[PDB]
């Protein structure tokens, strides 16, 4: 009964496409013609954090906007002090290749994972004074790509076996799973209200999942190639998505279609990380052109270039109060901007 | 109180500069292959025995080496291959399923996809053609699978620049060098000249497979160090 089911499925995406096309009355570029633009954004490198031995793959700001944790492929994970350029902890890892890096909102735990399919969580504030591993998670058969802390007992993960999954830190088992992707999931971004997250994969799809329910809410398909980058707007009602089309695309959750395309003719290289500002006006995107562009989110014009890295920017992070932008790249340096 | 935190940061940076000389003295080797290929004989003879990956930190000739085999993965290998840009070599293990889709054709398309990668443009491939005892035991049975399964074998001759082993049947030499220039056609079909291929006719229990990868890895860092000053 595959012939009737594929025709019913194609009529269902035709119904979804007609309902998406019926609800587009105006354009976001048309409605933002009363906004005075920001002009040129000038950012200078305030702190240059050196000390990593190899290529920095992932990074995560703390919630107090002073602590900072970065991962690298040499096999050691370094807790940073951003104001004084100090190193608080240096955590050696079992596996050399870590592609994700997470920091708890309470600051007590740091999780990381990579090609060994193990999400290792490390206890920072224990009594013995040394950073030891809390519990290894061993349920994914594919390579780990992204992880974000929800609580100190819950953590959602992205992996390369077409599966996202929630976790229990105390129990050690999967509370729920997310098995709706057809390609390798590379990133996820959490909501401010924490009950939703959206994850993009290699089949140019971003699925909005439900954390409590365990199902997929919406499907966003606007990109032409893989997706390496995803981020939520401050309010949690929209998200911007970076991919290998040299094109960032803004998707809205409520209208459930594509809002605005961020692209230029001169850029041919893909987007690795995206992050918003506190207001949501500035959208900063890493590239393989050895810099980071500051896109205005409502006007889609180049408002600034953070060009200080000698190699490819893998990760990007802005603080919770929006005070600083920290970019890490493949030349073992993580620079904190203005 | 801030000065002791600064001193702790200086101890952490001196610990990092202790491990920095450990890190740049180690050569990173990526192991690639399949389950048909011979890698259960590498675990007995090149000191793998002392998780989705199987790292091996081991030494020969007082030179640090570090091999890493990625286990069961998917067909779209384009996303975890960007993590291996800093390696010096790619160790490719091919078995011998010929004269016994296809396993050798899947290995040929795997070498085609790995060799023409964007992230592996400056990284050469060391090629191991394992299970050479199976290219001579089933020759005398006379099934002739390499003539049925490959139409280019009838127009292929033993090369004049090749160095065969004496005291051996020439059909075994044809069955060796047919796969050897089959795999060399993909390497010489690029023409960029930035990275090359090193074929070897290993058998599973060969105790010289470490010196082979030692001499070929010496050849890759000699390639880079002579290109740096425009000498090649």
């Amino acid at each position, epitope marked *: 009964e595959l012939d009737q089911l594929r025709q019913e499925a194609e009529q269902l995406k035709n119904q979804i496409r007609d309902a998406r096309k019926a609800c587009a009355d105006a354009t976001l570029s048309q409605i933002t013609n009363n906004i005075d633009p920001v002009g040129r954004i000038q950012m200078r490198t305030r702190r240059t954090l050196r000390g990593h031995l190899a290529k920095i793959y992932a990074m995560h700001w703390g919630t107090d906007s*002073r*602590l900072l944790v970065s991962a690298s492929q040499d096999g050691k994970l370094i807790i940073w*002090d951003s104001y*004084t350029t*100090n190193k*608080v*902890h240096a955590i050696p890892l079992r596996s050399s290749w870590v592609m994700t890096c997470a920091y708890a909102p309470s*600051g007590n735990y740091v999780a990381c994972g990579g090609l060994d399919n193990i999400c290792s969580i490390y206890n920072l*504030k224990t*009594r*013995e*004074g*040394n950073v030891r591993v809390s519990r290894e998670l061993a349920g994914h058969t594919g390579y780990l790509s992204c992880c974000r802390f929800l609580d100190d007992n819950q953590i959602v993960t992205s992996s390369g076996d077409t599966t996202c999954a929630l976790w229990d830190i105390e129990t050690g088992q999967q509370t729920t799973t997310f098995t709706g992707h057809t390609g390798d999931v590379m990133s996820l971004s959490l909501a401010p209200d924490t009950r939703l997250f959206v994850s993009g994969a290699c089949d140019a799809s971003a699925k909005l999942w439900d954390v409590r329910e365990g199902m997929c809410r919406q499907t966003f398909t606007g990109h032409e190639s893989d997706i390496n980058a995803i981020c939520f707007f401050p309010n949690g009602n929209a998200f911007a998505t970076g991919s290998d089309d040299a094109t960032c695309r803004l998707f809205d959750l409520r209208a459930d279609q594509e809002l605005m395309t961020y692209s230029h003719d001169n850029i041919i290289c893909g987007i690795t990380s995206v992050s918003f500002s506190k207001s949501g006006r500035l959208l900063l995107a890493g590239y393989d052109d050895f810099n980071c562009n500051v896109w205005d989110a409502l006007k889609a014009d180049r408002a600034g270039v953070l060009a200080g890295h000698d190699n490819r920017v893998s990760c990007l992070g802005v603080t919770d109060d929006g005070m600083a932008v920290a970019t890490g790249s493949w030349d073992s340096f993580l620079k904190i901007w203005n | *109180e*801030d*000065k*002791a*935190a600064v*001193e*702790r940061s200086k*101890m952490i940076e001196k610990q990092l500069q202790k491990d920095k000389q450990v890190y740049r003295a180690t050569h990173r080797l990526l192991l690639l292959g399949a389950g048909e290929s011979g890698k259960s004989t590498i675990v007995k003879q090149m000191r793998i025995l002392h998780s989705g990956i199987f790292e091996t930190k081991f030494q020969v000739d007082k030179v640090n080496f570090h091999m890493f085999d990625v286990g069961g993965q998917r067909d779209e290998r384009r996303k975890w291959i960007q993590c291996f840009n800093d390696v010096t070599a790619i160790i490719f293990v091919v078995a011998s399923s010929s004269y016994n889709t296809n396993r050798l054709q899947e290995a040929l398309n795997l070498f085609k996809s790995i060799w023409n990668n964007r992230w592996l443009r400056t990284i050469s491939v060391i090629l191991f053609l394992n299970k050479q005892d199976l290219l001579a035991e089933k020759v005398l049975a006379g099934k002739s699978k390499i003539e049925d399964y490959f139409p280019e074998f009838a127009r292929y001759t033993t090369p004049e620049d090749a160095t065969p082993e004496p005291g051996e049947d020439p059909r075994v030499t044809r069955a060796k060098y047919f796969i050897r220039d089959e795999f060399l056609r993909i390497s010489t079909a690029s023409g960029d000249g930035r990275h090359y291929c090193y074929p070897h006719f290993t058998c599973a229990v060969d105790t010289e497979n470490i010196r082979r990868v030692f001499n070929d890895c010496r050849d890759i860092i000699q390639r880079m160090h002579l290109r740096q000053y425009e000498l090649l």
Partner: single-chain antibody
Amino acid sequence: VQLVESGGGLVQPGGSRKLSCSASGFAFSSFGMHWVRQAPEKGLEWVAYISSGSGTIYYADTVKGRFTISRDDPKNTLFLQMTSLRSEDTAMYYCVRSIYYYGSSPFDFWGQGTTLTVSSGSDIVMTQATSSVPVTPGESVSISCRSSKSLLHSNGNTYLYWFLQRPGQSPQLLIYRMSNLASGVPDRFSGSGSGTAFTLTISRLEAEDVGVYYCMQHLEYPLTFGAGTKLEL
């Protein structure tokens, strides 16, 4: 976590006997170490300190020129050479464990203490006004302390530590950097104040909160403690 001291006893004046603190239950090489002594009739005072990795060594004004403090990181053992011992040096010597990074909790663990008895033959003062306060369980007594200069540094961090010394027990840490509570301390103590005046407020006091309360500044070295406020039922 266990710090056990040894090498104490009766000491002739002008003699020498070396104290030894043994560390167990924690990684000794990443923790700064202190020796803090207490008179049999007076309060605590600070003697010496080595940072982690044997980098810097500090002493007090009536301490330097006579003593020598040393560590042993594989053997996990503190040492304190005690030469030219005088009649004012009869005290109970505590082995003190501390760490220093941002957001750390120094002075969290204290030793049991060894007794060394000597026989016969600028600077910041801390003024604790009340010496004895007669308390009742449930009265919620708040006690205060004063400093000679403003302890609030230029980075926004003020430096004041609080202790509770039970009869027969070590002065365990309650509050570090005037606001923060230590690990294992219940949420009954709170501290606040300006850079000069400080107050420690207890709410809903039980029978386990009796003892002597002490301060410490980390504006600079040497470390001064104060008089002490005793709570009596």
